[PDB]
Design a protein around this ligand. Sequence first.
Ligand SMILES: *[C@@](C)(CO)[C@](*)(O)[C@H](CC(C)C)NC(=O)[C@H](Cc1ccccc1)NC(=O)[C@H](CC(C)C)NC(=O)[C@H](CCc1ccccc1)NC(=O)CN1CCOCC1
Ligand SMILES: *[C@@](C)(CO)[C@](*)(O)[C@H](CC(C)C)NC(=O)[C@H](Cc1ccccc1)NC(=O)[C@H](CC(C)C)NC(=O)[C@H](CCc1ccccc1)NC(=O)CN1CCOCC1
Ligand SMILES: *[C@@](C)(CO)[C@](*)(O)[C@H](CC(C)C)NC(=O)[C@H](Cc1ccccc1)NC(=O)[C@H](CC(C)C)NC(=O)[C@H](CCc1ccccc1)NC(=O)CN1CCOCC1
Ligand SMILES: [Cl-]
Ligand SMILES: [Cl-]
Ligand SMILES: [Mg+2]
Ligand SMILES: [Mg+2]
Ligand SMILES: [Mg+2]
Ligand SMILES: [Mg+2]
Ligand SMILES: [Mg+2]
Ligand SMILES: [Mg+2]
Lengths: 222, 195, 195, 204, 222, 233, 196, 196, 214
Amino acid sequence: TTIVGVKFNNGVVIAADTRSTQGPIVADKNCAKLHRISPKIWCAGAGTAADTEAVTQLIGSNIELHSLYTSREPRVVSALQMLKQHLFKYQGHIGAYLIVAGVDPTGSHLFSIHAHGSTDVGYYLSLGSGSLAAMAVLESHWKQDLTKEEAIKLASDAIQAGIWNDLGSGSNVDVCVMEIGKDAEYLRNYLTPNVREEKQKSYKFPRGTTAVLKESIVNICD
Amino acid sequence: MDIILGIRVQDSVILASSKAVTRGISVLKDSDDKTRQLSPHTLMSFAGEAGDTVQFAEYIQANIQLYSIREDYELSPQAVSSFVRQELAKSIRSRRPYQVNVLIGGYDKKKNKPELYQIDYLGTKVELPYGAHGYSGFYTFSLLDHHYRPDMTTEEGLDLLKLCVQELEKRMPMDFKGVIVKIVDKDGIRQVDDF
Amino acid sequence: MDIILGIRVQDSVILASSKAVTRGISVLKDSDDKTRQLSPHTLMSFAGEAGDTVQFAEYIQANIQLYSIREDYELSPQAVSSFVRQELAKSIRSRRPYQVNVLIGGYDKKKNKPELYQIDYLGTKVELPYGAHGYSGFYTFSLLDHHYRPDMTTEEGLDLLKLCVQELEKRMPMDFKGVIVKIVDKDGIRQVDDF
Amino acid sequence: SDPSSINGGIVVAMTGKDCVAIACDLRLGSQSLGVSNKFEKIFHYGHVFLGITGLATDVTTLNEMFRYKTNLYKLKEERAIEPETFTQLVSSSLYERRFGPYFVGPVVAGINSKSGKPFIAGFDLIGCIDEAKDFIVSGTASDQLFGMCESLYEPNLEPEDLFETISQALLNAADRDALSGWGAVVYIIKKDEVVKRYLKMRQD
Amino acid sequence: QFNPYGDNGGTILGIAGEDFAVLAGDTRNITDYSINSRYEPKVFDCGDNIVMSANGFAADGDALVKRFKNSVKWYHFDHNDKKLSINSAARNIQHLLYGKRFFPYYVHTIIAGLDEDGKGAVYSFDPVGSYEREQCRAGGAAASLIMPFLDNQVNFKNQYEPGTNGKVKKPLKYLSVEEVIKLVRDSFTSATERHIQVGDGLEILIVTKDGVRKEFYELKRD
Amino acid sequence: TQQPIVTGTSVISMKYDNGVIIAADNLGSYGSLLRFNGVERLIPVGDNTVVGISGDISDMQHIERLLKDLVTENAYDNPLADAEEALEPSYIFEYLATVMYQRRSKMNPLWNAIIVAGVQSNGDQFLRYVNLLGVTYSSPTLATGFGAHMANPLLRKVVDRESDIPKTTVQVAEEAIVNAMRVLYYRDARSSRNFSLAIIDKNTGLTFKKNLQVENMKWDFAKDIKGYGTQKI
Amino acid sequence: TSIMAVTFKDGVILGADSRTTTGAYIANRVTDKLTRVHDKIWCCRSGSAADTQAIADIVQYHLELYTSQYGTPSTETAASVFKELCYENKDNLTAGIIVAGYDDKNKGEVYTIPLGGSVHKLPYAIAGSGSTFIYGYCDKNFRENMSKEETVDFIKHSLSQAIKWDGSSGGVIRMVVLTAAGVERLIFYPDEYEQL
Amino acid sequence: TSIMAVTFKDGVILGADSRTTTGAYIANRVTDKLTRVHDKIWCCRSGSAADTQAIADIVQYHLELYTSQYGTPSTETAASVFKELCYENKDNLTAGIIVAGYDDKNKGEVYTIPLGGSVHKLPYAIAGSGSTFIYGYCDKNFRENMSKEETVDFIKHSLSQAIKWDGSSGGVIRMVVLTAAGVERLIFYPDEYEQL
Amino acid sequence: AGATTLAFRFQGGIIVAVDSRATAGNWVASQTVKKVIEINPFLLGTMAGGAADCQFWETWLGSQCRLHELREKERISVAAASRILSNLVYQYKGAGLSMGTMICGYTRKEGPTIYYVDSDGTRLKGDIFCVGSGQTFAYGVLDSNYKWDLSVEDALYLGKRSILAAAHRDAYSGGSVNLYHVTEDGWIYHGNHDVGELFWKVKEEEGSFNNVIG
Ligand SMILES: *[C@@](C)(CO)[C@](*)(O)[C@H](CC(C)C)NC(=O)[C@H](Cc1ccccc1)NC(=O)[C@H](CC(C)C)NC(=O)[C@H](CCc1ccccc1)NC(=O)CN1CCOCC1
Ligand SMILES: *[C@@](C)(CO)[C@](*)(O)[C@H](CC(C)C)NC(=O)[C@H](Cc1ccccc1)NC(=O)[C@H](CC(C)C)NC(=O)[C@H](CCc1ccccc1)NC(=O)CN1CCOCC1
Ligand SMILES: *[C@@](C)(CO)[C@](*)(O)[C@H](CC(C)C)NC(=O)[C@H](Cc1ccccc1)NC(=O)[C@H](CC(C)C)NC(=O)[C@H](CCc1ccccc1)NC(=O)CN1CCOCC1
Ligand SMILES: [Cl-]
Ligand SMILES: [Cl-]
Ligand SMILES: [Mg+2]
Ligand SMILES: [Mg+2]
Ligand SMILES: [Mg+2]
Ligand SMILES: [Mg+2]
Ligand SMILES: [Mg+2]
Ligand SMILES: [Mg+2]
């Protein structure tokens, strides 16, 4: 994985690639690494795939119940605190590396969380196997007072750096924009620069090619 | 090493189990019966880690006998095999698993059919026409694959079984001191005294 | 597990060696002769690491045969045993030692006496009335200690040897597929074909 | 001593035009030794199909478990479970054993009875969902299946064409794997009919 | 402790026709999750209409090729410019590999060319020198992905004649150079999708009685 | 079997239209200790080649001696030593690559990663890498250590393939290298601010720049960063 | 890390670098290692980022609950809570913490808590991987009852050298001043401190 | 060990502690780690006592044979002979040596040779386990072209701090002065240097 | 690695039968491997264990056998040929060679002869030998059906049927069957037989493998 987060004027943007690996094999060419914790708090996940999904759903569930209990819109620091204390308790065995971002009544926020439970604050962050390729871009092109359109460009460029240069990352670029006073816009497959070219030949077989021993109707009804 | 074989024929199930019990460089016994009657028409042979084998077999025996008394009814071989599999499936993730492999030969009185189930220590169940555990199948399966017919009689099954034991006695490194053979059919369980 | 036995009686030396050759879970052969004639009145049986056994035995055989031709004279069993011991004594401190244990049965024509020498792979030589290598002595020595008399005949020695093989066949974990028996006396070396 | 490659086996699933297909080999072994050629790895709970590869005791155990859970689901909900919902149930159940997992590679396949949309999904042993438009692979010849499916597959295949594609993907993958083969089964699943075909393959 | 071996990834493919033979290979060179080069050739013209590739550990692969090229040169000096036949080259390469039996070249070697009857020939070697002549052979990282596809499309395995109850096999036949390159291109684009170490470029060397021709095709760079 | 003691970090390089650029910082680390600060890791050979070396510094000094001795030996009985029969980058590289592979095959490696940058006699750019394993590869951009992870992605945005080389000027290429060295100073814990840079052009020849510093850094935003999550002060 | 806390005439100043590492990669170059556990009780964190964060969060919770019941806690009390956590969980923690605070009665106080969980009250303390290189410098240059400006220069020069020699230390120099006046945050950038 | 060599106006001064350890036991508290390989080429020895002695003895032999044939060797030449031994036998040696010498042409020169066998020519050098604690102090206090008395004080204060913090360093401070005037040995005892 | 190789002596000479599969773990590398090495027109060798070790040294053996008959003007005995090979590998013992082979030949003074030669120095003369991962399966068919007075036709089938037995059960054995008949005048190749087609054919004609649906 490559994942990033970038702060801008009136909010925050996060992005991710869409490759899922199983050893040297690409298991999913278009997997979703951007997770919704609450409507305006989203999370980018790297590391152990099941752990990032499981931990983000658990905290998201508890955040919802908390939001209902307190009659308030959830805060990013609450998700951050709940996540890090959960991860710390499991001493890094839950391999979730997250970039947590969102907007709440306090403002716009951007954090990262590591598997062992350490958190960091920043205007621009990157995690995953392609974090170095992404961070190289962020360190080269980031500046203070970015606009919405500039932040999306920078974030996607950082993900592209991972896609092209890191073998752990690939395929497409997902983006989520969280602006203050607005609904969060989840941009699934914001870029698709890895479209498979037309095949040279069709491998549709003549019917009856496959040898068959037995046929039978399966009963799915009651 | 501990040799346990099983053959399901037309009207019966035949189980053959080695008689040797070895500990270190000494054959302590040469007449050991590696089986327990679970119910009048169900027999289980076993092989594996010392102590675990008998402890497990008798624990199963007690549970099936308890069921028989409670319901005044004999459980089907399929039902018994499923119960046994579950116990081994629980065991494998325990603190100290039962290292026991079993064959379950039974005659289903409702279906009027013989049934042979092979279950390893992991809880891996399969219904088979013929089965074995350990290295035993490495020698015998080629013979069974060849000569085994599904419509065989009990006598034909015993002759096929003799062929397997002869091959084991020829090519296996150890002396397993022959086998005790038992037959399971509609009339219940009986032992072949001369083999 | 390779069985080699030796018994020195009044007028001869008797060597008994197992016929099995096992590799993995398969008995590759059941008629293997684990011995070499070093000279007309000297016989050496052997057991140990695969390959090393035969390679060593034949190397010794060649050296003794070379001596016989050079001097037109047969070396005494004592002299042959000392030569063999030295070769093993050299071997144990080599880069790759011969892992071979041997018994040397011979009839000294000058003394008119049978002689049995036991030499392990370290080069540990002993002259004995009866000897063995490996686990074989663990079973048989109690029988030999009891029934062995120094004035026995060759026929009495063979009956005593039968008693040992029977005990091994009863209590040893593996099947060693019987033994080839050879007798060394004043008239030379001969094999007992029916044992 | 690698639990996921002791027994061997493979499962593959594919989508077509208003249909899905799921197929599996029939081998069950103990490492080098072939033990059974009738060990089916595909199960169904109502109209939802589940293939499972990996450790055979866990395959059997999980089938019994999901049969348990889908029967109770039906009694309380008064309706059969859908593929999307079942997929989440499988994921939840597997992650429950996160630090003592079932050594399996399950595959869900089916058609939603309400929307009519074809659905397939794959999982890792701790419940990570791998949803896909095209195909899902699992087992000891997953590498081989990825290679066949990625070249042979095309979108919107008719049931009769889809059958040939999935069958060829499985057969040729199985023949390049020692621990897979010994027979094969293919399920062709339409909205209200399901056909099951046993394939003829080499038995070595 | 010092490990003298490495894995430079990559995958190669040799197919033999009736009067021709091809030896393909991707141009990507990697270490772990990094790309070292997007274009680093590893299929070479060694003279006498022999093409060769030694895939795996690139340092050993370059050494072997370099030694074989040198072997071809000295074969000419010592035997009056005699042409080294493909079968003679194969046997020579066995001795090169087996000469380091106890400190092996960590490579999978494939050579291609024409035999002495003018017919297409491919030979494949294990790291220690066992070799075999074959119609079809994939080597390297994605060999497991490519090879079963070739079995199906080149050797027509598991394909039976329609309507014949799976009794009559689909008949073996020689493919054209055009049909073979189609299979090569589709083999590598499929492997590129699912294997992270495969991509960037595809270079094919085709061998006919006329000589050695090259063809290059781009692959996905993610 | 070795273990590296005093080490040098990344060496980065790229091709441009008329030549090549190579750079490396002036640090000799002793584990986590930044022990030596006046270490030159770019070593020119003649007026057309620069060898950039990372890894063990004692082994680097050995290679310096080999290259210096190579120039001496080439001049022996060679009237064209400063002309047609002068040392080429390809000759110098193949020599080192031969040595590196021989040493790994004796299980006694030179614990280095080397990049040989230069211009051939026919004007062609030469850029090739070799390491302690004897592994070799060439690319429009090459980098060792952290540079491979962070610099290559930035340099490949300028020259992503072969066709981008004639389109890339020396001004643009130098700018990218200098930018990359700044990023390495931000993110590599065994890097220094001071570095050397060398340009080998087919027209203007060899330009060797010493005592360069990373500048135009962004640190101001650090003042706004407080705590690790909840802390407001 | 390089961290230090120094008592002086008007109170105490905490100092730290801003580098966070994963092997040789700098995961964060603008880290804040000076963390508040109470209004005028702060700590310098070294060792595991996860462990030190978890500890500081628990201490902040304990001191907030202490304050609700018993009023403002002493710096010694804060150090005792840190110690209790570090000592009782010594087998599972990697945390080198310096506790610094300002009372009106006790003035500036500094307590250092090494790996084992021992407590040591000192006039000044240095810790972290980069502290090794400045034991000599700090010992020769430290004086009691320094002024604010002298103390700032002392910390600046000290951490400048620690950063210069330690690869595991770098970035900016953060400082937190604790006096009766209040809480002042300071920052110093590379271009300034490097050429000292 | 704590050792150092410092160039100055009139030449170079070598400095060292006198402690030799076996674990935590001090096997020799009055060790002489400053050893002559030529009239005005000396070395500071750190690491294995056996290895450094064997090396210095071989170098002294090489430089004696050099002198018989080619006249007085340069300090660079002496450092090269040390390097050759340390580099080619790096797998079997544990020796951190500083080579210091006085030429009339080149004046005072200092070469340091770390574990790997690399050579580094410097204005001054510090080495040994105790050097870690004075990197900051020495960097801040070293100046080029110091006087003899200034250089003696610099070494004295530096090794005083190294000894103070390093358990593997202690005893007396030995020094050797190399100038055109000749060779002067100096010694400084605990009662003097400890209370600096 | 995985393999099933056999060789047995009988009235009409020697039958040699092998499988064709090569595996690198679970991955099936090849189905077309040659596990009979044609040392010369009169001598055959089987491949089990290291493929390279068997190929290289049994080819080398043929070179030594050719040199023997050039110097002695007489065919080399199977005893002497097997001995050259076993003495050679014994020199390399401990280095890591992996070899389990049957050296097969038919001469005047010896008759049909088989020597099992192995990488740890073993050299055994015998009538029947089976080597490889599927050796146990093949032994069972061989032992139960073997007789000295077998015909050449029946002996060839027995060797073919024995490999099939192993190919079926042993995962690391299969692909195809290669048959050879060794006579005093030289060996005769009896074709390549795909196990896929051979299995179904034997099932139908023989009535065996009822456990398998077809
Ligand atoms: C980039 C792509 C990699 O750096 C990203 O970080 C992504 C993150 C996204 C998808 C959330 N990471 C992965 O894709 C991740 C990489 C990985 C692999 C192994 C351990 C940690 C991280 N891949 C996965 O998590 C896959 C997801 C599958 C493809 C749906 N899962 C596996 O590879 C599992 C690992 C499960 C696991 C168990 C215990 C501890 C840690 C992880 N492995 C397998 O399934 C392998 N094998 C299959 C056959 O059955 C036996 C198990
Ligand atoms: C200086 C750097 C050293 O004294 C400072 O002390 C700072 C203190 C600040 C940040 C509070 N310390 C670190 O930066 C600290 C160094 C460290 C590393 C390991 C153990 C103890 C201390 N770094 C970390 O804690 C990082 C922070 C992450 C990158 C945000 N975490 C890791 O390096 C984790 C920690 C795992 C761990 C191991 C042992 C004890 C506790 C935690 N390690 C990894 O992620 C593993 N990593 C994988 C890649 O290979 C390198 C190791
Ligand atoms: C300071 C102390 C460290 O930098 C100095 O460098 C001095 C240098 C002077 C004396 C030249 N170094 C030592 O005093 C040196 C420390 C040391 C120890 C081990 C390896 C390298 C350096 N001490 C020694 O060399 C002593 C001298 C003896 C006591 C006279 N020797 C040992 O400690 C020997 C050395 C064996 C050895 C091990 C590895 C590499 C080289 C040599 N060790 C022992 O006798 C074992 N001893 C047994 C009791 O348990 C503790 C270890
Ligand atoms: Cl932190
Ligand atoms: Cl000393
Ligand atoms: Mg198969
Ligand atoms: Mg090799
Ligand atoms: Mg790819
Ligand atoms: Mg620093
Ligand atoms: Mg001291
Ligand atoms: Mg098979």
